[PDB]
Amino acid sequence: NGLPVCGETCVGGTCNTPGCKCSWPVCTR
Numbered sequence: 001n002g003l004p005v006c007g008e009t010c011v012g013g014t015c016n017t018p019g020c021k022c023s024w025p026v027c028t029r
Contacts, residue, residue, distance in 0.1 A: 004028070 007017025007027035017027035 006020035
């Protein structure tokens, strides 16, 4: 079970993936 992520996790309400929004808990569009 693993949906495509654009980047890291939005832990601490923080997303660090440039160009990708957050979809807690993962940075995905």
